[PDB]
Design a protein around this motif. Structure first.
Motif, mmCIF file in Angstrom:
data_model
loop_
_atom_site.group_PDB
_atom_site.id
_atom_site.type_symbol
_atom_site.label_atom_id
_atom_site.label_comp_id
_atom_site.label_asym_id
_atom_site.label_seq_id
_atom_site.Cartn_x
_atom_site.Cartn_y
_atom_site.Cartn_z
ATOM 1 N N UNK A 18 14.877 52.011 -3.415
ATOM 2 C CA UNK A 18 15.933 52.607 -2.587
ATOM 3 C C UNK A 18 17.207 51.775 -2.628
ATOM 4 N N UNK A 19 18.347 52.466 -2.621
ATOM 5 C CA UNK A 19 19.656 51.831 -2.678
ATOM 6 C C UNK A 19 20.284 51.665 -1.298
ATOM 7 N N UNK A 20 19.469 51.625 -0.244
ATOM 8 C CA UNK A 20 20.001 51.468 1.099
ATOM 9 C C UNK A 20 20.227 49.990 1.415
ATOM 10 N N UNK A 21 21.250 49.667 2.221
ATOM 11 C CA UNK A 21 21.479 48.259 2.578
ATOM 12 C C UNK A 21 20.291 47.646 3.304
ATOM 13 N N UNK A 22 19.509 46.834 2.593
ATOM 14 C CA UNK A 22 18.335 46.174 3.160
ATOM 15 C C UNK A 22 17.366 47.204 3.745
ATOM 16 N N UNK A 23 16.847 48.057 2.860
ATOM 17 C CA UNK A 23 15.916 49.095 3.284
ATOM 18 C C UNK A 23 14.595 48.521 3.781
ATOM 19 N N UNK A 24 14.263 47.288 3.403
ATOM 20 C CA UNK A 24 13.025 46.640 3.819
ATOM 21 C C UNK A 24 13.348 45.228 4.279
ATOM 22 N N UNK A 25 13.095 44.948 5.554
ATOM 23 C CA UNK A 25 13.356 43.634 6.124
ATOM 24 C C UNK A 25 12.522 43.489 7.391
ATOM 25 N N UNK A 26 12.601 42.308 8.000
ATOM 26 C CA UNK A 26 11.873 41.997 9.224
ATOM 27 C C UNK A 26 12.862 41.461 10.249
ATOM 28 N N UNK A 27 12.661 41.834 11.510
ATOM 29 C CA UNK A 27 13.556 41.392 12.570
ATOM 30 C C UNK A 27 13.510 39.875 12.706
ATOM 31 N N UNK A 28 14.687 39.268 12.827
ATOM 32 C CA UNK A 28 14.827 37.828 12.970
ATOM 33 C C UNK A 28 15.368 37.489 14.353
ATOM 34 N N UNK A 29 15.099 36.256 14.786
ATOM 35 C CA UNK A 29 15.597 35.796 16.077
ATOM 36 C C UNK A 29 17.115 35.672 16.096
ATOM 37 N N UNK A 30 17.752 35.595 14.931
ATOM 38 C CA UNK A 30 19.201 35.490 14.845
ATOM 39 C C UNK A 30 19.664 36.166 13.564
ATOM 40 N N UNK A 31 20.825 36.812 13.630
ATOM 41 C CA UNK A 31 21.359 37.505 12.465
ATOM 42 C C UNK A 31 21.590 36.524 11.322
ATOM 43 N N UNK A 32 21.349 36.991 10.103
ATOM 44 C CA UNK A 32 21.521 36.161 8.928
ATOM 45 C C UNK A 32 20.253 35.412 8.562
ATOM 46 N N UNK A 78 19.629 32.362 9.327
ATOM 47 C CA UNK A 78 19.458 31.239 10.228
ATOM 48 C C UNK A 78 18.235 31.377 11.109
ATOM 49 N N UNK A 79 18.244 32.372 11.992
ATOM 50 C CA UNK A 79 17.107 32.579 12.868
ATOM 51 C C UNK A 79 15.848 32.908 12.088
ATOM 52 N N UNK A 80 14.704 32.599 12.695
ATOM 53 C CA UNK A 80 13.416 32.820 12.074
ATOM 54 C C UNK A 80 12.797 34.143 12.478
ATOM 55 N N UNK A 81 11.541 34.319 12.071
ATOM 56 C CA UNK A 81 10.818 35.543 12.388
ATOM 57 C C UNK A 81 10.696 35.707 13.898
ATOM 58 N N UNK A 82 11.088 36.880 14.391
ATOM 59 C CA UNK A 82 11.047 37.174 15.822
ATOM 60 C C UNK A 82 9.627 37.575 16.195
ATOM 61 N N UNK A 83 8.903 36.660 16.836
ATOM 62 C CA UNK A 83 7.527 36.914 17.269
ATOM 63 C C UNK A 83 7.621 37.501 18.673
#
Lengths: 57, 472
Positions: B125-139, B141-146
């Motif tokens: 897919x050509x969507x902007x970041x079609x597959x990702x995981x929520x992070x504690x901070x944008x970019x 920097x922040x880690x995986x949001x548990x």
DNA sequence: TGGCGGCGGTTGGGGCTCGGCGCTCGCTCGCTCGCTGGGCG
DNA sequence: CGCCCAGCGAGCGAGCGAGCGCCGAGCCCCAACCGCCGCCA
């Protein structure tokens, strides 16, 4: 290109298609009993426009 | 049990997001029709058809790959297919059982590759970041949001039919709330009606530091260096650590202001093995007073055991086994204050927010005799201050160390004796007339601590009287 | 019937502050891709 | 007997951080001046 299509209801006809005058019209084809008379007749188009305006009011 | 909020954008436009996709895939995706369960109040006209099937296939493949790579088929999950303002997405949730935070990145990429090679069949897919995981901070920097279990009824369930489309979950507590607005609203209301501290690596150490400070008896920056200069320097490297010093000092002061009793800090911990070497012992034995009885009287006076008679008065000329002990006690206790006998208007100006009231070579005044009798007779009273608002002075053991007769209460430019018996019936007379030698040495804080401790190891029946028994 | 002298408030400006976002360094770990070793026996 | 798993390892790069840097507003203390009062015929 990623935008959404132009989805509208029946009120879009008397708001843009029918208000158009002869120079902005040539022919039309439909099947609704209410809009069939307003194909190539400008009087029927104006009548339907007025009816829609009175209804939405 | 925590969870990972994975965001999987569902391609809405198969022509733009998946250019060159085979017609068979689109045909199979459009031919698959869906229907809500019988007990489902959700409107099907608002819900889509092909996007629903796409999201179902995507989440099914994701769950299969997760169960295959984590070796935890009994893991809990919670998928919710929604419709964003400009693109479809899913709030997938998977437990952290068998998958640490340092391995989630690789599993996510593997699942994405498998989905691209299976579902989309290579086409990415050509969507902007079609597959990702929520992070504690944008970019990056922040880690995986548990997140926690409370994240479902706080963001997912609140959403209603307009933003909701479908949802899949195996949890028994969110079964009927899959395709039912009534159940979702009921769960949201229950969660709101149900709803304190915060655990962090930066606050856990502070909670122990503030407790160790009060244990060591630190109330300023000099006391911190007195224990260990390196330790104090370590807690003031950056501005965040410097402000922490002031915060901890203020909190420790406000807490010490509300302990329970002064002896809690004056009484020693370990017992005494040689009391004869203590200077207080010699001072008490030289003036002709039983050290044991004197220690018992001091302990009873500092512990507010007498109540009305909870006061000691050392008589005889200045510095006669009276000023040394009082100075040592003032240096041992956290805060102290000298009664300004000269200022009859506000003699307790220096004794504001202090734990002990020390009267060094000062006569009694009639301007604050009535208010002082309350604190001396075990009673609370709000006295004024020198150019400051009043403040309650809880029953505190007062110590007098003067040479002239305190009964001669001065009232400005005269003297009276009306407050003789009232003040004598609530104080102990210690006729310490023996003068100490020049080489006697000043008493230290450890000496006062050992004295107060020995006062507890050998308790005797303290009689409530004016004249204290002498050493026979 | 008359005026000439100082003291508490400001109040923005230089400065400290706590946060955000943004970037830039250590660690990592299922995967890969060879190298070789009893055993065939 | 010249291969056999097949057992071993040595990275190995796409991740993960986490930790700092540099703005970004946002409070905070401080100094050059206004209001009001004391001071004499």
């Amino acid at each position: 290109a990623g935008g959404g299509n132009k989805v509208v209801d029946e009120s879009y006809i008397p708001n843009y298609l029918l208000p158009k005058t002869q120079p902005e019209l040539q022919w039309a084809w439909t099947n609704m009993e209410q809009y069939l008379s307003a194909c190539l007749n400008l009087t029927e188009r104006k009548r339907l426009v007025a009816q829609h305006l009175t209804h939405v009011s | 049990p925590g969870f990972y909020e994975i965001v999987i954008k569902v391609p809405s436009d198969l022509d733009e997001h998946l250019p060159g996709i085979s017609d068979s895939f689109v045909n199979w995706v459009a031919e698959k029709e869906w229907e809500l369960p019988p007990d489902s109040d959700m409107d099907l006209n608002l819900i889509e058809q092909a996007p629903l099937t796409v999201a179902e296939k995507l989440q099914r493949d994701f769950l299969t790959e997760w169960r295959r790579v984590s070796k935890a088929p009994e893991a809990l999950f919670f998928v919710q297919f929604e419709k964003g303002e400009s693109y479809f997405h899913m709030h997938v949730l998977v437990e952290t059982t068998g998958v640490k935070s340092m391995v989630l990145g690789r599993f996510l990429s593997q699942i994405r590759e498998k989905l691209i090679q299976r579902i989309y069949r290579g086409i990415e897919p050509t969507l902007p970041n079609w597959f990702a995981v929520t992070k504690t901070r944008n970019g990056a920097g922040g880690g995986n949001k548990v997140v926690d279990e409370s994240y479902i009824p706080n963001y997912l369930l609140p959403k209603t039919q307009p933003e909701l489309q479908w949802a899949w979950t195996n949890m028994e507590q969110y079964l009927s709330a899959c395709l039912n607005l009534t159940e979702r609203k009921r769960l949201v209301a229950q969660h709101l009606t149900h709803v304190p501290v915060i655990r962090s690596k930066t606050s856990a150490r502070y909670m122990e530091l503030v407790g160790w400070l009060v244990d060591k008896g630190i109330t300023s920056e000099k006391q911190w260096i007195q224990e260990d200069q390196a330790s104090y320097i370590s807690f003031n490297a950056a501005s965040n650590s410097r402000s922490q010093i002031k915060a901890a000092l203020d909190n420790a002061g406000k807490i010490m202001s509300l302990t329970k009793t002064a002896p809690d800090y004056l009484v020693g911990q370990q017992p005494v093995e040689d009391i004869s070497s203590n200077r207080i012992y010699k001072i008490l034995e030289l003036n002709g007073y039983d050290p044991q009885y004197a220690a018992s009287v001091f302990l009873g006076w500092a512990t507010k055991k007498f109540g009305k008679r909870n006061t000691i008065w050392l008589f005889g000329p200045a510095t006669t086994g009276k000023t040394n002990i009082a100075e040592a006690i003032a240096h041992t206790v956290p805060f102290y204050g000298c009664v300004n006998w000269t200022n009859e208007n506000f003699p307790f100006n220096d004794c504001v927010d202090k734990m002990v009231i020390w009267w060094e070579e000062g006569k009694m005044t009639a301007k604050v005799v009535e208010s002082a009798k309350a604190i001396l007779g075990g009673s609370k009273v709000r006295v004024d201050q020198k150019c400051k608002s009043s403040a309650q002075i809880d029953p505190t053991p007062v110590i007098v160390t003067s040479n002239t007769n305190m009964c001669a209460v001065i009232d400005g430019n005269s003297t009276t004796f009306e407050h003789q018996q009232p003040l004598q019936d609530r104080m102990f007379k210690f006729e310490l007339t023996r003068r100490l030698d020049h080489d006697f040495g000043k008493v230290t804080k450890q000496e006062v601590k050992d004295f107060f401790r020995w006062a507890k190891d050998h308790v005797v029946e303290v009689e409530h009287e004016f004249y204290v028994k002498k050493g026979g």
